[PDB]
Design an enzyme around this catalytic site. Structure first.
Site, PDB file in Angstrom:
ATOM      1  N   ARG A 108      46.107  49.473  45.351  1.00 45.12           N
ATOM      2  CA  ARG A 108      44.837  49.657  46.039  1.00 45.12           C
ATOM      3  C   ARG A 108      44.513  48.425  46.867  1.00 45.12           C
ATOM      4  NH1 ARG A 108      43.983  51.123  42.136  1.00 45.12           N
ATOM      5  NH2 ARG A 108      42.114  52.428  41.932  1.00 45.12           N
TER       6      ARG A 108
ATOM      7  N   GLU B 263      48.400  32.312  35.630  1.00 45.75           N
ATOM      8  CA  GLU B 263      48.214  33.723  35.941  1.00 45.75           C
ATOM      9  C   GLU B 263      49.548  34.324  36.372  1.00 45.75           C
ATOM     10  OE1 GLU B 263      45.735  34.497  39.286  1.00 45.75           O
ATOM     11  OE2 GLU B 263      46.817  33.138  40.624  1.00 45.75           O
TER      12      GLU B 263
ATOM     13  N   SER C 263      41.267  54.471  33.928  1.00 45.64           N
ATOM     14  CA  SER C 263      42.180  54.853  34.999  1.00 45.64           C
ATOM     15  C   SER C 263      43.569  54.261  34.805  1.00 45.64           C
ATOM     16  CB  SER C 263      41.621  54.405  36.348  1.00 45.64           C
ATOM     17  OG  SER C 263      42.524  54.700  37.392  1.00 45.64           O
TER      18      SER C 263
ATOM     19  N   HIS D 239      45.043  41.998  31.021  1.00 45.36           N
ATOM     20  CA  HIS D 239      44.318  42.324  32.241  1.00 45.36           C
ATOM     21  C   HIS D 239      42.904  42.774  31.902  1.00 45.36           C
ATOM     22  CE1 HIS D 239      43.681  44.021  36.336  1.00 45.36           C
ATOM     23  NE2 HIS D 239      42.999  44.935  35.670  1.00 45.36           N
ATOM     24  N   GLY D 240      41.927  41.921  32.193  1.00 50.07           N
ATOM     25  CA  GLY D 240      40.532  42.233  31.929  1.00 50.07           C
ATOM     26  C   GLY D 240      39.888  42.997  33.070  1.00 50.07           C
TER      27      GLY D 240
HETATM   28  N1  LIG Z   1      41.852  40.719  36.374  1.00 49.79           N
HETATM   29  C1  LIG Z   1      42.569  39.861  35.655  1.00 49.79           C
HETATM   30  O1  LIG Z   1      42.862  40.085  34.492  1.00 49.79           O
HETATM   31  C2  LIG Z   1      43.001  38.573  36.297  1.00 49.79           C
HETATM   32  C3  LIG Z   1      43.953  37.757  35.700  1.00 49.79           C
HETATM   33  C4  LIG Z   1      44.307  36.576  36.334  1.00 49.79           C
HETATM   34  C5  LIG Z   1      43.698  36.239  37.539  1.00 49.79           C
HETATM   35  N2  LIG Z   1      42.789  37.044  38.105  1.00 49.79           N
HETATM   36  C6  LIG Z   1      42.150  36.660  39.370  1.00 49.79           C
HETATM   37  O2  LIG Z   1      41.280  37.716  39.776  1.00 49.79           O
HETATM   38  C7  LIG Z   1      41.561  38.138  41.109  1.00 49.79           C
HETATM   39  C8  LIG Z   1      41.671  39.657  41.156  1.00 49.79           C
HETATM   40  O3  LIG Z   1      40.885  40.276  40.143  1.00 49.79           O
HETATM   41  P1  LIG Z   1      41.213  41.793  39.743  1.00 49.79           P
HETATM   42  O4  LIG Z   1      42.704  41.971  39.718  1.00 49.79           O
HETATM   43  O5  LIG Z   1      40.410  42.155  38.524  1.00 49.79           O
HETATM   44  O6  LIG Z   1      40.578  42.560  41.011  1.00 49.79           O
HETATM   45  P2  LIG Z   1      41.487  43.198  42.177  1.00 49.79           P
HETATM   46  O7  LIG Z   1      40.660  43.349  43.420  1.00 49.79           O
HETATM   47  O8  LIG Z   1      42.779  42.442  42.257  1.00 49.79           O
HETATM   48  O9  LIG Z   1      41.762  44.684  41.641  1.00 49.79           O
HETATM   49  C9  LIG Z   1      40.652  45.577  41.705  1.00 49.79           C
HETATM   50  C10 LIG Z   1      40.331  46.288  40.393  1.00 49.79           C
HETATM   51  O10 LIG Z   1      40.697  47.669  40.419  1.00 49.79           O
HETATM   52  C11 LIG Z   1      40.757  48.082  39.055  1.00 49.79           C
HETATM   53  N3  LIG Z   1      41.545  49.325  38.832  1.00 49.79           N
HETATM   54  C12 LIG Z   1      41.037  50.511  38.465  1.00 49.79           C
HETATM   55  N4  LIG Z   1      42.040  51.410  38.376  1.00 49.79           N
HETATM   56  C13 LIG Z   1      43.186  50.780  38.697  1.00 49.79           C
HETATM   57  C14 LIG Z   1      44.509  51.200  38.772  1.00 49.79           C
HETATM   58  N5  LIG Z   1      44.850  52.485  38.492  1.00 49.79           N
HETATM   59  N6  LIG Z   1      45.456  50.309  39.136  1.00 49.79           N
HETATM   60  C15 LIG Z   1      45.131  49.040  39.418  1.00 49.79           C
HETATM   61  N7  LIG Z   1      43.861  48.611  39.353  1.00 49.79           N
HETATM   62  C16 LIG Z   1      42.866  49.466  38.999  1.00 49.79           C
HETATM   63  C17 LIG Z   1      41.304  46.887  38.284  1.00 49.79           C
HETATM   64  O11 LIG Z   1      40.665  46.804  37.008  1.00 49.79           O
HETATM   65  C18 LIG Z   1      40.962  45.679  39.145  1.00 49.79           C
HETATM   66  O12 LIG Z   1      40.053  44.785  38.489  1.00 49.79           O
HETATM   67  C19 LIG Z   1      42.896  37.533  41.505  1.00 49.79           C
HETATM   68  O13 LIG Z   1      42.833  36.949  42.808  1.00 49.79           O
HETATM   69  C20 LIG Z   1      43.201  36.487  40.453  1.00 49.79           C
HETATM   70  O14 LIG Z   1      43.118  35.170  41.016  1.00 49.79           O
HETATM   71  C21 LIG Z   1      42.428  38.185  37.503  1.00 49.79           C
END
Ligand SMILES: NC(=O)c1ccc[n+]([C@@H]2O[C@H](COP(=O)([O-])OP(=O)(O)OC[C@H]3O[C@@H](n4cnc5c(N)ncnc54)[C@H](O)[C@@H]3O)[C@@H](O)[C@H]2O)c1
EC number: 2.4.2.36
Lengths: 207, 823
Positions: A60, A155, A51, A42-43
């Site tokens: 969230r 994913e 957090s 998870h990037g």
């Molecule tokens: N982020 C990834 O690694 C990843 C992997 C595959 C696909 N995607 C694509 O990216 C889109 C979503 O990106 P996202 O997941 O980075 O953004 P998101 O809107 O789904 O989540 C928001 C952000 O809040 C952050 N965060 C901070 N504290 C957290 C906590 N305590 N719990 C959970 N999250 C917390 C996370 O880093 C996350 O990036 C998806 O629709 C998907 O298609 C992302």
């Protein structure tokens, strides 16, 4: 604690602090030993990683249809690598690199992991996903794995209830501060980490 | 004494009675000690906004008979004395010249035993080159008596040799246009004493006292009180031969009437002979008060000698009676201080110290104040009068009567007296006086010339530069002292206009200076004052520039993380002329885009079309780097301009080669593809894209690195000149010119010295010239290395690799492929 032995782990633009490859192999071993399994990467940005690692994954609001809400991870670190960065510049306009995180779940949750060839986050797949998990979206104590896009990379979506039961630790795969936006160079992935990054076999049919 | 603003003004209009002077002295000679005795005696105080002490005002009152001895126009018995602060070491050459340039006289402090040291000797020939009249004071006499226990004749001969070596330097380097400037004790231009105990005297002081006991004009009395004059005690006769009739030795006048009384007290007090002291003190009329009547040893000797011969009075005597006033001195220093015609209307106004002619105020430096982070200009009015509210032509270094470059026609908010540590506003200030100004720090970096004449050239400019060519990394040893360092850096950068404190992308705290030493003193002050916290300072590092040699081999392409946005561009070198123009304010970022394009087009051969498509400069939004818009019919292009510009700011601050700033790099955006919805063209998407495309284009445009190069001006006696070339020929130095001073055997060698070869340069130059060399280097130009930075073995690549490791980067320089779109 699931971070192994060593100094205090923190996230920086210079890289994750006090997180060698060896310490990862230890923490990963101690995780498996307690009944946990690795499911993907998870990037994200520094403050987020902090957090997650020290506070835990918590639900969230997120920009998408409610039926697809949940924690987003990827088996292939290259994919998640693309989200390991600031999504919005600061006051001056700096966009600093992020961090790669490793997501672990209780093996007891594996019965809820499914896969599909259909592209996710689309109304054309909701039906099939609801068929596999055995109930109407959104995902709950279960997860779905499928192409992020047409012909794209895989994913995994962890329903929030299941996502809040994860244990996340830093990865030994470093983000590049002097190449933010660049693609993950496969030669920057520690051969030792690649060895512990095998994914479980997910169900193609419902329970 | 406490003075009102009215008294000061009334004291400043009488320029004929002002003494602009500095103190030339080694620190270990009691320089600050003699200076203290002066301020505790003649220090002027005023009857909120504090400043760094740069000059002290002294008041001296004399008799009508005394004023008749001054061989220059005078008016009244009041005298204003401006004691301009001097650097603590020669190494600060640039500011040593600054003080001397605004002075007319000099109090040269010399040691009794060690005599004239190498430093004081070097500074002196510089002062003499500036046509400064010197007066000498032989300090540390206390040591000769207490430690060495020398005889009266030994001490005398010691003074004779000391004064001899001084005049050897004076007659040699003092310009023949000043006449005999040599110092003679008999002529009251040489004093002796101990700063420590706070006593000092002149031949004129003892002459005045005995003048009555011999019914003799002190003229021939002080004439006797030195050299071969002998008062036979047995016959009560004055003689010119050191033996009486029977061939017995006679004690010389100086040893008999001056040294003896002092030797008596030293012996009576330090030997605790309680019965002699009272008697010995009475005949000299030295009355002790209450608590003092019980003192013994040095404690007593100090009081007695302080009441016997107050140090400040001996010094003030020479300063007022023998040091040139602004009127007298400017008459022969004008032609030297004016970078223009000698018969100019302004140069003439400087020779006459004319307060009615066009203003000619000199700004020697900028002084830190408590009024926010603003600086107060410090200097001297050589012509006309400066007034509060008066609009003046601030003429900087590059200024020339022809062009309007480096010119700022602004108004003087307030003119103020620099009362040491405090400020006192005044209406105006006639020519001849030292003064400070308010509200100029944003127009003058450090030095400059104020003028009210549209045809007046700059005054002898002192070359400086803000360009940070050396820098280090600061870091607290205790992680809890972080806040103390952060505020310390904010404080440090405020105490000096030429000090730079910033944060690299990695978050490192960086301190950058203009030179090895300049950066050295700043790291001291930071770890002792501004922060006062134990710091971890990395070795000094030279600042390099990243540039391109040609146009990108091919178009640079790079797309955003969401894969929806793309930026096509190409990089190409910028002419040095242009980069210089940009750095010199000619081509200005905050200038009208149309007016500016006309310049670039007409004067630099730019397609006026491109010159109007300039989106920004960089880094810091003004550097010698440009982004040119060459796109054709791109929808919503403007909605990403802020992001593109932002990216260019970071990309030009830290280049792809090894994190160093870019220079002379033109980026031409050839094409752009954007998502229709602005939700996917935010900063998060475009910034990285532009940033990376710029890197790819740069790495395709034949990358090169540039090293900073100094221009060093060295003053050195003919003999030691050989030592200069000896050092330059192993520092990759290149000689520009070697000029010789007309009369004196002083040479002025100028050469280019790579900054990365200047580390410890003054130390080596010191030895090679025996300390006779007077270094003075300022940043000149950037030099592009021929070697390939991408080649680890080449001279450029060697620097690169070492740097990359030092930064913890991948040893190898990234290929353009890394930043190019991964296709
Ligand atoms: N982020 C990834 O690694 C990843 C992997 C595959 C696909 N995607 C694509 O990216 C889109 C979503 O990106 P996202 O997941 O980075 O953004 P998101 O809107 O789904 O989540 C928001 C952000 O809040 C952050 N965060 C901070 N504290 C957290 C906590 N305590 N719990 C959970 N999250 C917390 C996370 O880093 C996350 O990036 C998806 O629709 C998907 O298609 C992302």
């Amino acid at each position: 604690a699931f971070l192994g032995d060593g100094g205090d782990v923190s996230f920086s633009t210079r890289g994750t602090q006090n997180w060698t490859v060896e310490r990862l192999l230890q923490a990963h071993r101690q995780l498996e030993e307690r009944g946990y399994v690795f499911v993907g990467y998870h990037g994200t940005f520094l403050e987020a990683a902090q957090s997650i690692v020290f506070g835990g994954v918590r639900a969230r609001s997120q920009d998408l249809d409610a039926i697809w809400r949940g924690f987003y991870i990827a088996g292939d670190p290259a994919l998640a690598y693309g989200y390991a960065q600031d999504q919005e510049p600061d006051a001056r306009g700096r966009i600093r690199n992020g961090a790669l995180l490793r997501v672990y779940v209780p093996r007891s949750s594996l019965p809820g992991f499914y896969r599909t060839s259909l592209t996710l986050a689309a109304p054309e797949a909701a039906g099939e996903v609801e068929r596999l998990i055995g109930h109407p979206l959104p995902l709950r104590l279960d997860a779905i794995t499928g192409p992020e896009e047409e012909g794209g990379r895989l994913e995994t979506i962890l329903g929030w209830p299941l996502a809040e039961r994860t244990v996340v630790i830093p990865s030994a795969i470093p983000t590049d501060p002097r190449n933010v936006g660049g693609d993950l160079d496969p030669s920057s992935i520690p051969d030792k980490e690649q060895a512990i990054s095998a994914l479980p076999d997910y169900a193609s049919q419902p329970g | 004494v406490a003075f009102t603003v009215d008294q000061m003004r009334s004291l400043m209009d009488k320029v004929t009675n002002v003494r602009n002077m500095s103190v030339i002295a080694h620190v270990d000679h009691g320089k600050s000690t003699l200076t203290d005795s002066l301020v505790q005696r003649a220090g002027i105080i005023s009857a909120g906004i504090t400043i760094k002490s740069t000059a002290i005002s002294l008041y001296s009152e004399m008799s009508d008979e005394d004023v008749k001895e001054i061989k220059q126009k005078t008016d009244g018995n009041s005298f204003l004395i401006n004691l301009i602060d001097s650097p603590g070491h020669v190494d600060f050459s640039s500011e040593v010249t600054a003080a001397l340039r605004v002075t007319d006289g000099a109090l040269v402090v010399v040691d009794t035993i060690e005599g004239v040291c190498v430093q004081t000797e070097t500074v002196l020939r510089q002062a003499l080159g500036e046509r400064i009249k010197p007066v000498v004071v032989i300090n540390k006499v206390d040591r000769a008596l207490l430690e060495l226990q020398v005889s009266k004749e030994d001490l005398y001969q010691t003074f004779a040799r000391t004064v001899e070596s001084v005049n050897v330097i004076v007659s040699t380097y003092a310009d023949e246009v000043l006449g005999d400037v040599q110092v003679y004790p008999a002529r009251g231009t040489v004093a002796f004493g101990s700063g420590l105990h706070g006593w000092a005297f002149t031949i004129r002081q003892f002459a005045t006292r005995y003048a009555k006991k011999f019914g003799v004009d002190k003229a021939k009395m002080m004439d006797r009180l030195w050299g071969d004059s002998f008062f036979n005690p047995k016959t009560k006769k004055w003689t010119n031969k050191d033996t009486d009739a029977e061939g017995k030795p006679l004690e010389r006048a100086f040893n008999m009437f001056i040294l003896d009384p002092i030797f008596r007290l030293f012996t009576a007090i330090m030997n605790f002979k309680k019965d002699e002291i009272p008697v010995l003190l009475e005949k000299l009329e030295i009355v002790l008060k209450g608590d003092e009547k019980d003192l013994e040893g040095k404690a007593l000797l100090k009081v007695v000698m302080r009441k016997f011969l107050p140090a400040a009075d001996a010094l003030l005597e020479m300063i007022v009676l023998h040091l040139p006033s602004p009127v007298t001195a400017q008459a022969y220093r004008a032609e030297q201080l004016y970078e223009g015609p000698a018969d100019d209307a302004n140069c003439i106004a400087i020779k006459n110290c004319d307060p009615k002619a066009d203003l000619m105020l000199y700004v020697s430096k900028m002084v830190p104040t408590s009024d926010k982070g603003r600086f107060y200009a410090f200097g001297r009015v050589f012509a006309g009068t400066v007034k509060s509210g008066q609009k003046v032509r601030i003429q900087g270094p590059n200024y020339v009567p022809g062009k309007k470059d480096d010119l700022f026609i602004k108004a003087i908010q307030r003119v103020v007296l620099m009362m040491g540590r405090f400020v006192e506003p005044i209406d105006d200030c006639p020519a001849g006086n030292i003064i400070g100004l308010v509200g100029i720090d944003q127009f003058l970096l450090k030095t400059g010339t104020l003028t009210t004449s549209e045809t007046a050239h700059n005054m002898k400019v002192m070359k400086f530069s803000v360009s940070p060519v050396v820098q280090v990394a600061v870091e607290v040893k205790n992680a809890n002292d972080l806040p103390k360092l952060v505020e310390g850096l904010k404080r440090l950068s405020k105490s000096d206009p030429c000090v730079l404190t910033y944060m690299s992308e990695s978050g490192e705290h960086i301190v950058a200076g203009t030179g090895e030493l300049h950066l050295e003193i700043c790291l001291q002050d930071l770890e002792h004052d501004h922060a006062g916290v134990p710091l971890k300072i990395s070795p000094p590092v030279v600042a390099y520039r990243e540039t391109v040699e040609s146009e990108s081999s091919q178009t640079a392409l790079s797309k955003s993380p969401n894969k929806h946005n793309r930026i096509y561009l190409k990089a190409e070198p910028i002419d040095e002329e242009v980069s210089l123009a940009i750095e010199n304010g000619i081509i200005n970022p905050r200038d009208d885009f149309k007016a500016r394009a006309r310049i670039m087009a007409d004067d630099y051969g730019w397609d006026v079309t491109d010159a109007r498509k300039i989106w920004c400069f960089g880094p810091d939004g003004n550097g010698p780097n440009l982004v040119i818009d060459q796109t054709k019919a791109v929808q919503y292009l403007h909605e990403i301009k802020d992001s593109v510009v932002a990216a260019f700011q970071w990309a030009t601050k830290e280049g792809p080669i090894f994190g160093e700033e870019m220079r002379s790099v033109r980026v031409n955006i050839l094409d752009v593809t954007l998502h229709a919805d602005a939700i996917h063209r935010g900063g998060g998407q475009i910034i990285p894209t532009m940033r990376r495309a710029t890197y790819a284009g740069f790495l395709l445009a034949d990358p090169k690195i540039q090293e900073p190069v100094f221009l060093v001006e060295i003053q050195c006696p003919e003999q030691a000149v050989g030592g200069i070339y000896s050092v330059l020929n192993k520092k990759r130095g290149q000689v520009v010119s070697e000029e010789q001073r007309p009369g004196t055997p002083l040479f002025t060698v100028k050469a280019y010295l790579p900054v990365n070869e200047s580390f410890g340069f003054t130390g080596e130059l010191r030895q090679a010239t025996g300390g006779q060399a007077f270094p003075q280097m300022v940043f000149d130009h950037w030099s592009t290395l021929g070697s390939d930075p991408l080649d680890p073995t080449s001279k450029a690549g060697e620097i690169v690799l070492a740097a990359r490791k030092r930064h913890g980067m991948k040893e190898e320089v990234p290929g353009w492929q890394e930043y190019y779109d991964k296709l």
